[PDB]
């Protein structure tokens, strides 16, 4: 039976006026035969954090009646891609930018023994790195990406211009903007941000930027755009690019986000990762525009281009975002342009120990169905803007 009310609870002398009942307060200890004293509130003389209690939200000075919705890593959008596009006022073009694809077409871009080196790195990242027989994704997933970046970073010999960019750690990105009168905030942190001294080349011309006015953001009535976001009544308006002002590499080249959870239920779905990347990538791009052009709302004459790569060590997702407007109050008008490449598999499966069936080595200790094309797509993004 459904219970209304906690189931746990389910199965004279003082009145005299002008006189005070005697109580064991004088005794300084409880005795059943004496009346319970009336105790005024106790004062410790100092504040104990262990016994301290946080004040209620409404009493906070920063409390605001309007709700600020904050998006963080754990947030999972119910509508996935559709909600992200509406919130970020961006127009989606399938596939990577035409320029990015052409980067790896150049023979010089291709690394010498690129597939073999990736295969060796994959084997090292999965097996040789540690003494454990079967290392888990929590360990090799950070390692494989770092090793791949070093291999890509080794291309500075071919292209000295690559020396103008560096990667930072635990960069925090945050912005606040309004969509159709709805207050939206995106908070992103962790991972790494590749930054270069020069902005990434604009993918779409000003004429193309104006053409985005025709595009209309898709709606999903009656579910509100603020679904799955953290509703906040105590908040502060902030814009963060991951670095304080004065950074010599103000332009972020790529925004990485790694999902190293070993278990699939513990791992965000591919759609959710891209949705998280879109908001986080949009926030970083928006912060750059706000710093450069101030807090005014207007269509950006010079679009800002930023990239994001999300991988779990086996599946790789590549995202490129171009910020075309800062006038995000309206849902119609110039829209940001985003290029999406999803479900790029480095390898279908990897065996960390030899698989012997009927005294036959069916599977070696190496990646299964390894696809060097995925690394090429990753290589294209890294080299983009330099070659």
């Amino acid at each position: 039976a459904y219970e209304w009310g906690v189931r746990s609870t389910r199965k004279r002398v003082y009145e005299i006026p002008g006189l005070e009942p005697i109580t064991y307060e004088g005794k300084k200890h409880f005795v059943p035969w004496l009346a319970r004293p009336i105790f005024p509130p106790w004062e410790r003389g100092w504040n104990d954090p262990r016994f301290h209690r946080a004040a209620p939200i409404h009493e906070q000075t920063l409390y605001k009646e309007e709700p600020c919705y904050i998006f963080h890593q754990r947030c999972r959008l119910l509508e996935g891609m559709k909600q992200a596009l509406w919130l970020t006022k961006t127009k989606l073009i399938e596939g990577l930018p035409k320029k990015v694809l052409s980067l790896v077409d150049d023979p010089a871009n291709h690394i010498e023994n690129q597939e073999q080196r990736v295969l060796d790195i994959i084997s090292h990242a999965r097996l040789w790195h540690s003494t454990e027989d079967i290392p888990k994704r929590e360990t090799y997933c950070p390692l494989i990406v770092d090793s791949l970046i070093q291999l890509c970073k080794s291309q500075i010999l071919k292209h000295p211009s690559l020396a103008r960019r560096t990667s930072a750690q635990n960069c925090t990105l945050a912005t606040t903007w309004n969509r159709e009168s709805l207050l939206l905030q995106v908070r992103g942190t962790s991972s790494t941000i590749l930054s270069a001294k020069d902005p990434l080349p604009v993918i779409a011309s000003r004429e193309e930027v104006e053409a985005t006015r025709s595009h209309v953001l898709e709606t999903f009535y009656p579910i509100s755009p603020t679904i799955d976001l953290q509703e906040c009544h105590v908040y502060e308006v902030k814009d963060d690019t991951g670095f304080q002002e004065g950074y010599p590499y103000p332009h972020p080249h790529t925004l990485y986000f790694l999902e190293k959870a070993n278990l699939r239920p513990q791992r965000f779905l591919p759609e959710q990762l891209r949705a998280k990347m879109l908001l986080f990538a949009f926030a970083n791009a928006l912060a750059q525009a706000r710093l450069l052009y101030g807090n005014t709302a207007k269509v950006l004459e010079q679009p800002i281009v930023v990239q994001s790569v999300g991988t779990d060590g086996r599946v790789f997702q590549f995202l490129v975002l171009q910020l075309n407007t800062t006038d995000l109050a309206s849902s119609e008008g110039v829209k940001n342009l985003v290029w999406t490449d999803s479900d790029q598999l480095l390898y279908r499966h990897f065996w960390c120990r030899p698989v012997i069936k009927k005294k036959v080595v069916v599977e070696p200790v190496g990646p299964v169905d390894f696809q060097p094309e995925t690394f090429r797509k990753f290589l294209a993004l890294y080299l983009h803007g330099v070659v």
């Binding site: 090292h124 070093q150 560096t166 010599p248």
Partner: protein
């Protein structure tokens, strides 16, 4: 078996480690393409020293790891950039493998003891030692480094001798798996290495040690970590080649490591000549292991505003000089 900590606060721990390792520690460095040293004075990335003021990150909850966390971030970034910057000059760096906070293990036997009591009283047992280290960074290459001195090189200096038992100095024995590791499995092609990087904790830093009255032990901490880390790391490499106690190495194994307290930087070079350290295997062995170390030197003075003042190129030159070295 005895558990050996590469970083330990025991007095004369380097001397005790040398006795267990049969290593002689000679003070100073081992006997012996322009790149704009001034460009590397800044290409070494004072930018990460600039980024520690710019790169925003969630504040540590402890409030004590803030200082230590900062040192790790700068060192990792500096190592990454330096490898890329020095790659064109030295092709070895291109083929090298970089290891971050990975474990190096070595298991060796030196000496013997008589059981004093118990059901096995009087029985003879060897003294077992295990060294487990996790260098902040180390570089693994597929080719052996050039020797700094020919094998069988002899010097008048004598290895330390310990009067008391190992247990008298704080040390405890435990029974667990014996492991010899080079930082990666034998399948990894890079069975050799270029350099090893170590970071001293705050507890062992100069300021606390001086307050604790163990100012003289600052160099000992540097030496103990260097000798333990390099010997264990070098010994594993030789075993990967098939050389063991009864089959001593036919070629000297050499390695170098750098230990920093966060400001000061020290350089150490180790050469492994003997794998026969057991009483039986070392019964008649004239060869001995040799280690060369240098005093810790500041790499800079302070970092105010958004730049670094007082950077010392000399320490960087040793890193540059070390990195440029390649086998002949």
């Amino acid at each position: 078996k005895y558990v050996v900590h590469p970083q330990i606060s025991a007095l004369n721990a380097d001397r005790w480690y040398q006795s267990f390792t049969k290593t002689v520690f000679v003070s100073g460095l081992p006997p012996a393409p322009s790149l704009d040293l001034a460009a590397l004075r800044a290409a070494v990335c004072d930018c990460i020293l600039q980024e520690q003021v710019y790169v925003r990150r969630r504040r540590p909850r402890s409030l004590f790891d803030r200082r230590q966390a900062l040192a790790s971030s700068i060192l990792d970034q500096v190592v990454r950039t330096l490898v890329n910057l020095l790659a064109p000059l030295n092709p070895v760096l291109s083929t090298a493998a970089l290891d971050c906070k990975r474990s190096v293990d070595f298991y060796w036997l030196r000496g013997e003891e008589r059981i004093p009591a118990g059901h096995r009283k009087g029985h003879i047992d060897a003294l077992r030692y295990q060294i487990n280290d996790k260098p902040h960074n180390q570089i693994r290459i597929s080719k052996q480094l050039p020797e700094f001195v020919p094998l069988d090189y002899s010097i008048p200096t004598e290895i330390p001798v310990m009067k008391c038992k190992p247990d008298k100095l704080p040390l405890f024995r435990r029974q667990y798996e014996n492991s010899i590791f080079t930082g990666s499995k034998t399948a990894d092609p890079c069975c050799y290495g270029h350099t090893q990087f170590h970071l001293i904790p705050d507890r062992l830093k100069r300021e606390r040690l001086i307050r604790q009255n163990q100012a003289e032990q600052v160099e000992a901490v540097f030496r103990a970590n260097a000798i333990a880390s390099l010997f264990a790391w070098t010994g594993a490499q030789a075993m990967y080649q098939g050389f063991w106690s009864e089959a001593d190495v036919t070629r000297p194994f050499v390695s170098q490591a750098v230990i920093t307290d966060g400001k000061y930087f020290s350089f150490f070079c180790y050469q492994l000549n003997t794998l026969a350290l057991t009483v039986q295997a070392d019964q008649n062995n004239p060869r001995k292991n040799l280690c060369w170390g240098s005093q810790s030197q500041p790499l800079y003075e302070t970092v105010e505003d958004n730049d670094v003042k007082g950077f010392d190129d000399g320490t960087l030159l040793q890193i540059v000089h070390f990195l440029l070295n390649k086998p002949r």
